[PDB]
Amino acid sequence: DIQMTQSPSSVSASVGDRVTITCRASQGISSWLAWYQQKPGKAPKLLIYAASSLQSGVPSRFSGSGSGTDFTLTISSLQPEDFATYYCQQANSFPLTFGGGTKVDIKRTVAAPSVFIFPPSDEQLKSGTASVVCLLNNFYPREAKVQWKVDNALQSGNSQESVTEQDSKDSTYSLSSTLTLSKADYEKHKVYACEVTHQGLSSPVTKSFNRGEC
Amino acid sequence: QVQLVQSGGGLVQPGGSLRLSCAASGFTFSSYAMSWVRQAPGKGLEWVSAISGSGGSTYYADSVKGRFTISRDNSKNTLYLQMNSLRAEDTAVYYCARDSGSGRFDPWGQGTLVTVSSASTKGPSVFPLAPSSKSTSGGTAALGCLVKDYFPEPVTVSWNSGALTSSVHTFPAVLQSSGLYSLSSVVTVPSSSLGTQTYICNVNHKPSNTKVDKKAEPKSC
């Protein structure tokens, strides 16, 4: 199968910036590569076909180059509507394959997250499940690492994360992480902590509560 | 104007079948090849199948060969996809697309969501996400509501009957191992307000006719 590797996975740039996206084919695909723009919740829109030919109606700031195995998309001057995820697609042989996508971000200054932790309610504790929630509020860039520890033991496989779309006013993200347990397990441990790693933090931030004092 | 209008998506039981339609208008459908492409939650695009303008040649991705069936009715100008033996991983938005020459796709349909899941409509339980009583006033306090165990979307959350709009984040729902959805809606407020002001999330789940007002008053921890 023709493997498509798109790089980078994410790019943060300011309005007006030049952005370059690469697409590498595992095998020779001559010039039969297309580029697409997908805004959130919308259908993909054709931007570029035959590696370098501009589709009608697409602004001239978009350009494609490359051949064989190596291809490049360039937005010479980023404009607010060009924030989207961009996909390359090969049309040389079946199966048709897409790259992994590149989400293009809006640049702002680095912002550290405010971190909060929420124990489960007593109501929940009557149903037999416990949800502990770690909230990351208003941060940039999106990359942050959240680790859950219950009495300093690393949890794995029992948490889920959700990230907001970018805020239209201040360009930050928020993250909700929900760790799910049985009631019995929640009553058998004391210290619950969410540990946060983020580019904007000089050291890990840990927020915790003691169950027996709640 | 070239238009693709999709229909037929929805909830299907595991092992079941569903038929998707893509009605084409504004161009000669019989002169163009067509494709189905799908998109899993939070994932990229994945190609499923293609058919030539006459219908004589069909092509399938390896993950789907033998299980789904692409067809077209050139007399009604509608493309189709009969989907059999469904699995949870086939849950996706499906797009129909025109091969406009050299493998470029123009136009795309709007997409239609197929959810392959074994579940009934359930109204959500709403639980407070409460800070503790020990918050330094002047700081920023977070509070919220955990909206747990519902199907289908959407739930709408407003705060204080629409009066509180600043600093609200309603997070995208996550699908649990149980097959039910969960999301959190949170708001940050000055910590000094926790003793004098009430914070109530208004949750509306229209498919199950569930309306819940839940207050995230805190607890002494």
Pairing verdict, β B58-60 and B45-51: antiparallel
Alpha-carbon gap, residue B21 to B34, rounded angstroms = 12
Mutation target to probe the A interface, by most A beta carbons within 10 A, among B106, B132, B140 is: B106
Alpha-carbon gap, residue B49 to B90, rounded angstroms = 14
Do A124 and A97 fall within a single domain?
Answer: no
Distances (CA, A) of B130 to A58, A127, B185, B199, B221: 49, 18, 12, 10, 10
State phi, psi for A109 to the nearest 5 degrees: -65, 155
Alpha-carbon gap, residue B182 to A133, rounded angstroms = 12
* DSSP structure string for B59-90: EE-TTTTTTEEEEEETTTTEEEEEE-S--GGG
Check: CB of residue B178 under 8 Å from CB of residue B168: no
Alpha-carbon gap, residue B184 to B201, rounded angstroms = 11
Q: Determine the number of helices (DSSP H) and then strands (DSSP E) in chain B.
A: 0, 19
Alpha-carbon gap, residue B19 to A213, rounded angstroms = 55
B residues 46..85 contacting A (CB < 8 A): 46-47, 50, 59, 61-62
Q: List Cβ neighbours of A47 (8 Å cut-off, separation of 6 or more).
A: A34, A35, A36, A37, A54, A55, A58, A62, A86
**A89:B105 CB<8 A:** yes
Check: CB of residue B173 under 8 Å from CB of residue B153: yes
Sequence ranges of the domains in chain B? 3-116, 125-215
Q: Which residues of A169-179 are buried (b: 16+ CB within 10 A; e: fewer)?
A: eebbbbbbbbb
- Cβ atoms < 10 Å from Cβ of A106: 16
Nearest chain A Cα to B177, which residue?
A158
Do A124 and A186 fall within a single domain?
Answer: yes
Do A51 and A144 fall within a single domain?
Answer: no
Return the closest-CA partner of residue A85 out of B39, B13, B193.
Answer: B39
List of chain B residues whose C-beta atoms are within 8 Å of the C-beta of residue A49 = 100-104
Helix (H) or strand (E) holding B201: strand B200-205
Do A162 and A120 fall within a single domain?
Answer: yes
**Residue where one domain finishes, among candidates A73, A106, A139:** A106
Cis peptide upstream of residue A113 (ω within 30 degrees of 0): no
**Residue where one domain finishes, among candidates A81, A106, A131:** A106
Return the closest-CA partner of residue B68 out of B84, B56, B55.
Answer: B84
- Give the single-character DSSP code of A121: P
Of B46, B106, B172, the CB nearest to A162: B172
| Experimental technique | X-ray
Tokens 């076909």 -> residue: A49
Alpha-carbon gap, residue B101 to B115, rounded angstroms = 32
* CATH code of A144's domain: 2.60.40.10
Do A171 and A102 fall within a single domain?
Answer: no
Helix (H) or strand (E) holding A149: strand A144-150
Domain ranges, residue A166? 114-213
- Give the single-character DSSP code of A165: P
Nearest chain B Cα to A129, which residue?
B148
Of B59, B142, B221, the CB nearest to A116: B142
**B44:A101 CB<8 A:** yes
R_g of chain B computed on alpha carbons: 23
Tokens 């702002």 -> residue: A108
**Residue where one domain finishes, among candidates A86, A106, A126:** A106
Alpha-carbon gap, residue A90 to B59, rounded angstroms = 15
Do A82 and A10 fall within a single domain?
Answer: yes
Do A100 and A147 fall within a single domain?
Answer: no
Which residues on adjacent β-strands are paired with residue B39?
Answer: B45, B93
Structure tokens at A214: 């709640």
Tokens 């007006």 -> residue: A16
Structurally, at CATH architecture level, domain B125-215 sits in Sandwich (2.60)
- Give the single-character DSSP code of A122: H
Measured between CB atoms, does B176 come within 8 Å of chain A? yes
Tokens 């009631």 -> residue: A183
**A214:B132 CB<8 A:** yes
A residues 43..82 contacting B (CB < 8 A): 43-46, 49-50, 55
Alpha-carbon gap, residue A111 to A175, rounded angstroms = 14
State phi, psi for B161 to the nearest 5 degrees: 60, 30
Mutation target to probe the B interface, by most B beta carbons within 10 A, among A2, A87, A121, A168 is: A121
Do A18 and A78 fall within a single domain?
Answer: yes
Alpha-carbon gap, residue B160 to B134, rounded angstroms = 23
β-sheet with B68-73: strand ranges across: B3-7, B18-25, B78-83, B68-73
Alpha-carbon gap, residue A205 to A114, rounded angstroms = 9
B130: distance to nearest CA of chain A, Å? 6
Nearest chain A Cα to B126, which residue?
A124
Return the closest-CA partner of residue A118 out of A42, A205, A194, A22.
Answer: A194
CATH 2.60.40.10 correct for B3-116: yes
| Strand, helix or coil for residue B140 | strand
State phi, psi for B179 to the nearest 5 degrees: 90, 0
State phi, psi for B160 to the nearest 5 degrees: 50, 45
Alpha-carbon gap, residue B184 to A175, rounded angstroms = 10
Distances (CA, A) of A120 to A133, A150, A163, B65: 8, 14, 21, 46
Do A127 and A207 fall within a single domain?
Answer: yes
Alpha-carbon gap, residue B74 to B55, rounded angstroms = 9
* DSSP structure string for A17-67: --EEEEEEESS--TT-EEEEEE-TTS--EEEEETTTEEPTTS-TTEEEEEE
Alpha-carbon gap, residue A66 to A52, rounded angstroms = 8
Structure tokens at A134: 């770690």
- Please classify residue B6 by burial: count the beta carbons closer than 10 Å to its beta carbon, then call 0-12 exposed, 13-18 middle and 19+ buried: buried
Amino acid present at A98: F
Alpha-carbon gap, residue A90 to A2, rounded angstroms = 8
A residues 105..144 contacting B (CB < 8 A): 114, 116, 118-121, 123-124, 127, 131, 133, 135, 137
- Domains contained in chain A, number: 2
Resolution to one decimal, Å: 2.7
List of chain A residues whose C-beta atoms are within 8 Å of the C-beta of residue B171 = 162-164, 174, 176
Alpha-carbon gap, residue A113 to A96, rounded angstroms = 40
Do A120 and A98 fall within a single domain?
Answer: no
Alpha-carbon gap, residue B105 to B48, rounded angstroms = 14
R_g of chain A computed on alpha carbons: 22
Cis peptide upstream of residue A141 (ω within 30 degrees of 0): yes
The residue numbers preceding gaps of C to N over 2.5 A in chain A are: none
Q: Both ends of chain B: CA-CA distance in Å?
A: 63
Are both B3-116 and B125-215 of the same fold?
Answer: yes
Alpha-carbon gap, residue A34 to B106, rounded angstroms = 11
Structure tokens at A139: 């941060």
Instruction: Go through chain A and tell me how many residues it has.
Output: 214
Check: CB of residue B41 under 8 Å from CB of residue B117: no
